[PDB]
């Protein structure tokens, strides 16, 4: 709903085209919801954090002094403070800033098994990787040099720890279970505060500003739509996303009486839309709820997990439900 979207659409096209020219079409890698990718060095160097499987891969296709290119990115990535509102993952500008509290602190250790919070240890660790873990690849035409760093095994729990207070607040406020909130959050970004989709979802809970964002503001009697900075603010984001979860539950899918059937529906609707979920059972929103209110919740899970028209949405329900079963028990 803007020229913000369109100016941003073009920047996207422009950004991707700059990468394509240097890495070749098959090597175009871009930041995602569960993936931080930051280009530096005029697109010759990229720093990739895969939050889903816990790897930090630093790459360069620079032909001169590649080891030097890699060292610079390794240290900054390990030391970067998170203020995702200030980071542009769609430019090659170095807006990377070193703070007293690196975002990755406790998620990775150096080769001596210690967490990294100072520039000295990060440097010693970079030199070690460069001497013992330097890999080289061919894209068919030119050499890419890299360093892979594995995060601690429990990196996901360590990263979610940063947002449990915000989840507890939003949970008590909106009447939505903590386990559902975390399960949505995990499935959407693996607790990545730099999360960006190409469906315009922003932040930890992947809030689409123009649909869900706008809707939530209205529900609370607020005007306008949430800014880009607002949704990259973790507390703002988790509050907004949880509000949309409660909205799906009270108004859009409220005709569902069994609370466990409603959840399956709410979860699916979070990704694919409330409209589509009802339309699986009947074109009449009222009849659709009436059919659901006569079937067991396990049929409802089974119905949505197979007979929903988006392949993405069918997977989404299975993923969130799985995630929730490990957050629900305390």
Curated annotation (Swiss-Prot):
Location, primary (coarse class): membrane
The protein's name in its UniProt record: Membrane-bound lytic murein transglycosylase C
GO cellular component terms, semicolon-separated: cell outer membrane
Function, as annotated: Murein-degrading enzyme. May play a role in recycling of muropeptides during cell elongation and/or cell division.
Keywords noted in UniProt: Cell outer membrane, Cell wall biogenesis/degradation, Lipoprotein, Lyase, Membrane, Palmitate, Signal
Gene3D superfamilies: 1.10.530.10
Entry-linked SUPFAM superfamilies: Lysozyme-like
Subcellular location field: Cell outer membrane
Pfam families: Mltc_N (PF11873), SLT (PF01464)
Catalysed reactions, as listed in the record: Exolytic cleavage of the (1->4)-beta-glycosidic linkage between N-acetylmuramic acid (MurNAc) and N-acetylglucosamine (GlcNAc) residues in peptidoglycan, from either the reducing or the non-reducing ends of the peptidoglycan chains, with concomitant formation of a 1,6-anhydrobond in the MurNAc residue
Molecular functions (GO terms): hydrolase activity, acting on glycosyl bonds; peptidoglycan lytic transglycosylase activity
